[PDB]
Design a protein around this nucleic acid. Sequence first.
RNA 1: AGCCAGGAUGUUGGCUUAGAAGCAGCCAUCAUUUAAAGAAAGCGUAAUAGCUCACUGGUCGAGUCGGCCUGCGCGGAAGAU
Lengths: 286, 141, 176, 38
Amino acid sequence: DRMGANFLKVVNQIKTRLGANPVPLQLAIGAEEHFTGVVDLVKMKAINWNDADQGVTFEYEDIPADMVELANEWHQNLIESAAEASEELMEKYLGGEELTEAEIKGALRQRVLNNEIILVTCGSAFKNKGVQAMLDAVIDYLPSPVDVPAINGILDDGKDTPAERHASDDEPFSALAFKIATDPFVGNLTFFRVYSGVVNSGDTVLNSVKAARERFGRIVQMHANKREEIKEVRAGDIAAAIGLKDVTTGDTLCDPDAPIILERMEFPEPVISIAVEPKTKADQEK
Amino acid sequence: AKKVQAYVKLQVAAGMANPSPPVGPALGQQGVNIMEFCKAFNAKTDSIEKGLPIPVVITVYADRSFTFVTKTPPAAVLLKKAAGIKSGSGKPNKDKVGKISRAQLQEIAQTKAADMTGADIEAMTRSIEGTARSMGLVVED
Amino acid sequence: SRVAKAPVVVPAGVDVKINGQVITIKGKNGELTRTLNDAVEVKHADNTLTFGPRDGYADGWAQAGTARALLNSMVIGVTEGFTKKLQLVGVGYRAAVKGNVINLSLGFSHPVDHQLPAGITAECPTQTEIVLKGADKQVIGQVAADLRAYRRPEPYKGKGVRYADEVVRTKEAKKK
Amino acid sequence: MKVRASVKKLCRNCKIVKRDGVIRVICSAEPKHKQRQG
RNA sequence: AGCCAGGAUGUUGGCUUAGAAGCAGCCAUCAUUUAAAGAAAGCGUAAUAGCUCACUGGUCGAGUCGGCCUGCGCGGAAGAU
């Protein structure tokens, strides 16, 4: 909703600078100030938004008459994007079997596990124009923890046997340690995410890469700010693996007699170095 | 040959494949693949013992084309290839070290006579005596 | 002089109305008249126009030296014309022609739409390029320079409205 | 326009024309080289 | 004085070569062709590509140019019922 904001320029600028292959889907209706419609091209439906409300309507209509031909020349490039994704849609682009909304995404979802095309959407966050539109693609173009290759614990030093473990609750427990913040209540905190398996409350969770013993305290979830005590952590939640005695960047959070992960790829280098000096001589003690 | 578009003669010792930064721009004038000028000259560069600056000129053409002229190394660096040191000009008329007679100067001029139409034998002889006096070198025969 | 060795050749298709000091040129698409000063002696001799400085005003070699350059431009301006293109380099800045009015997307809290006088057929191939067409050499610059004076060429980015042939000198920040 | 009593032709391409009587000197690329009095 | 107009081309011009590559600066300060070109004036610039001065080589086809001396003129020149 700004001047100079050409949607078709930027997505066709990626093919020049970033060198990628983007085929966009949700196009633009409106001259950026009277902007009212976002042109979803699979279902060929424009969406009405709020007059100025923080979120009332979702009214779907047809393609408006002021863009009846740009929808024509851009939908035919959408339905190209499955004939060269899977080999089986090659003979019905030319034969003329109908390219429905549901059929094309079954090929393009498998085009996200290799990542040759990215899916683009224009709209406004602040003007409440597109946010309610942007959620339905996440369940259909962004991958799930059970649709991906799951936890792959290799071994230790014996042999390189990468083992795809299960994404369900039927595995040994596994997690990782990252975003390990602090607090003046308990000391150390984490923002950890469990990939599969279920843990109960109270566990001898180790950190099996650095040979240390830790015990699993009272886990707390947030609204990104507020303390909500999560007792039973299910497979896929993100919480605070509290009470770790020592913890490093990206080591395992795993019960013994189980698979073990060990990874610290791309340890950075903080470059600019400034020397802090105390104010009082009581300060250098603290 | 050509005109106000482009004509600069700059090339230094051809043992270095990568275009040296100050030479870069004479290759950075009319859109070359810099791998092409590396692959053009190396078929004949394996007939030399490298160490002297060998010159080429660049000359251009309309679409994406270009051309270049191969000659022999100049006698100015041939004066200071035999003399051992590459830079002797510290004081021109106050240094008297190092002699080469005219016979060396003409046999490095036959390779000019077998390559180029200017830089003739007898006319360059005083300037190959003139690059000696500026360096502080002596000549007798 | 050089100006005295410069007579102007009127072609067929542009008619002169010599009422002495007041000449009204009946041309192709307009009427390019100039009421000159009395330091001139005008005569459309055969076809090529000849002029002369009047006595007393011996500085009329200047005052008609303007005129020799003047009427040459007038007979070629009423027929062929001037392409006066301007280059809009501004973040979110557009240009669009309707009737005889130009919009000015000029980074303000309010739109500026100024109406442009006669002797102007303006055009706009895009949001950054804008044609101006005219018959007088003065009017093809005067309406052009007013737009350029609303947003002069900024010499830290290259921002501003600038002519087609004009080349700015943009500098560098050099402190922060 | 800086003012000073001395108009000295300073830049290499410095035009001088007498607009209104007071001299102001015209460079091309340097705005710094333009004085007006004298 | 302008439009075409080559900026004929030996060379990297050293030093000290990291670039001080005609264009940072000290000593030389020759010129292969001299109907047009200096081992050189700035900008582009770490260096150069870009743009010129150099001779205007070909067109206009007549006057033109830089200083010395004086007659006068302009600026310099802003004050308080």
